[PDB]
């Protein structure tokens, strides 16, 4: 159950996810997963980042879910569950701004 996951924030807005992530104490990779505001059945992985060019900022990655079962950001790399997707991206940065580190504070 994804709703049992502490990083699953469910139905919160894009602006709200940014308010939470734009916290000075958040190191790179702080994250949360929420429902998409516009695509039914899609989710969004919101991630905090930091660099000297942009400073603290947030990136949003759409996560697709196939009725055939897979969850993925890129169709080339799919997972059997949202939980497995989160675990993979906590170890590999791949095309993300940073690997996922810890759940966002509220």
Ligand X SMILES: CC(=O)N[C@@H](Cc1ccc(C(F)(F)P(=O)(O)O)cc1)C(=O)N[C@H]1CCCCN(Cc2ccc(-c3ccccc3)cc2)C1=O
Phi, psi of 33 (to 5 degrees): -120, 135
94 binds ligand X (CB under 6 A): yes
From CA 72, how far away is CA 53, in angstroms rounded?
29
Does 39 interact with ligand X (rule: CB under 6 A)? Answer: yes
The answer to whether 73 touches 51, Cβ cutoff 8 Å, is no
Residue 61 near ligand X by CB under 6 A: yes
Residue 65 binding ligand X, by CB under 6 A: no
The phi and psi torsions of 32 (rounded to 5 degrees) equal -160, 155
CB of residue 95 to ligand X, shortest distance in Å: 2
Sites of contact with ligand X (CB under 6 A): 14, 36-39, 42, 44, 59-62, 73-74, 94-96
């Amino acid at each position: 159950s994804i709703q049992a996951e502490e990083w699953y924030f469910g139905k919160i807005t894009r602006r709200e996810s940014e308010r939470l992530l734009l916290n000075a104490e958040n190191p790179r990779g702080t994250f949360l997963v929420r429902e998409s505001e516009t695509t039914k059945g899609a989710y969004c992985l919101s991630v905090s980042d930091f660099d000297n060019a942009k400073g603290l900022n947030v990136k949003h990655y759409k996560i697709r879910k196939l009725d055939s079962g897979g969850f993925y950001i890129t169709s080339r790399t799919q997972f059997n569950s949202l939980q497995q997707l989160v675990a993979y991206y906590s170890k590999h940065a791949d095309g993300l701004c940073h690997r996922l580190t810890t759940v966002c504070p509220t």
